[PDB]
Design a protein around this ligand. Structure first.
Ligand SMILES: Cc1cn([C@H]2C[C@H](O)[C@@H](COP(=O)(O)OP(=O)(O)OP(=O)(O)O)O2)c(=O)[nH]c1=O
Ligand SMILES: [Ca+2]
Ligand SMILES: [Ca+2]
Ligand code: NA
Ligand code: NA
Length: 319
DNA sequence: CGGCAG
DNA sequence: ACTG
DNA sequence: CAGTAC
DNA sequence: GCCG
């Protein structure tokens, strides 16, 4: 659509993200998306200024791209950015870890493997560096969800297991599998992890653990047989009282969740993976000094409704 | 000025 | 929400 | 807590 | 980076 611009802008956006300038990177991100929501190639500097999320600086840069044919700033990106991206693509390693590794002289994953002090999570991330960067076919994601469900419904047939994330949004490929487990009885979800995970371990399905919380588990799995890659797996067990808000959170997308939660804030409300709250007292820094009333949200439609929004099917949330 | 989801 |  | 991830 |  406007790929003549976005391509060059995405490079600068990633340059900012890996370097730790999150908000400026966030600004570039929102502009990139907007430039993807336009239908007519931007033709004037004031045409860009008309686009939401595009300002004078961004408008000017896009003007430079049209007449000049390229963005000059792209040529002053630090030489460190490719290395910082390489390092930050290790699961468990962020900008702060990547910059420190660079300051310490590390420039390759061979350096990291041989010299860097890695956390347990990071050592698992490095081991699966190539696999965690690969997406998977929807069909494989189905096999993985079913594998978790059968293991869960074996020790309690009432458990409800739902694959969320990009899968539920109907995407052709999934970066990783996101499973939401609950129980309609309101109490039978408690303490299932210990046995659910052990069942999944004894089979060989679960290969590594990254996070093991009371409510969330994040780890690595590999389906049986030949030609299989290691895949990232997220499991969240929640009380039935929050099933709707959790399903909405875990279905996403991430930018959809952030926009909704921002809307709730304007309307004096707060939306979380746990509940949609009202009468939310907030302070100067847009900060919640006091919580309010949990609003009844038995279904996803209730959240949309309580927020004054038309219901959006999961596939309509892929922002 | 300062938030940008929780 | 987790981790250390 | 800071860092990281979802 | 944008925007109220
Ligand atoms: C990463 C992220 C996810 N989420 C929510 C919405 C996501 O759909 C859900 C799962 O996270 P992800 O699995 O990271 O996102 P995704 O499944 O939609 O895309 P992908 O195919 O690459 O896996 O968690 C947030 O609310 N905020 C975030 O920053
Ligand atoms: Ca996912
Ligand atoms: Ca995930
Ligand atoms: Na990382
Ligand atoms: Na070295």
């Amino acid at each position: 659509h406007n790929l003549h611009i976005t391509e060059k802008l995405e490079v600068l956006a990633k340059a900012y993200s890996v370097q730790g300038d999150k908000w400026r990177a966030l600004g570039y991100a929102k502009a990139i998306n907007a430039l993807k929501s336009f239908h007519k190639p931007v033709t004037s500097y004031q045409e860009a200024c008309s686009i939401p999320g595009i300002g004078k600086r961004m408008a000017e840069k896009i003007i430079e791209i049209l007449e000049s044919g390229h963005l000059r700033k792209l040529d002053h990106i630090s030489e460190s950015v490719p290395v910082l991206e390489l390092f930050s693509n290790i699961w468990g390693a962020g900008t702060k870890t990547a910059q420190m590794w660079y300051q310490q002289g590390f420039r390759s994953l061979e350096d990291i493997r041989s010299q860097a002090s890695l956390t347990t999570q990071q050592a698992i991330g490095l081991k699966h560096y190539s696999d965690f960067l690969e997406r998977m076919p929807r069909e494989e994601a189905t096999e993985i969800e079913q594998t978790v469900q059968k293991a869960a419904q074996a020790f309690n047939s009432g458990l409800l297991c739902v694959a969320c994330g990009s899968y539920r949004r109907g995407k052709a490929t999934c970066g990783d599998v996101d499973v939401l487990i609950t129980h309609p009885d309101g109490r039978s979800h408690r303490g299932i992890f210990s046995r659910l995970l052990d069942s999944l371990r004894q089979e060989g399905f679960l290969t590594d653990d990254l996070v093991k919380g009371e409510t969330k588990y994040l780890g690595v799995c590999r389906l049986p047989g030949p030609g299989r890659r290691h895949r990232r797996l997220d499991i969240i067990v929640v009380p039935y009282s929050e099933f709707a808000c959790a399903l909405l959170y875990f279905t996403g997308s991430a930018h959809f969740n952030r926009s909704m939660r921002a809307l709730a804030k304007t309307k004096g409300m707060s939306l979380s993976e746990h509940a949609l709250s009202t009468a939310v007292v907030r302070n100067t820094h847009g900060a919640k000094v006091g919580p309010g009333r949990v609003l009844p949200t038995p279904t996803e439609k209730d959240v949309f409704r309580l927020l004054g929004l038309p219901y959006r099917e999961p596939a309509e949330r892929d922002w």
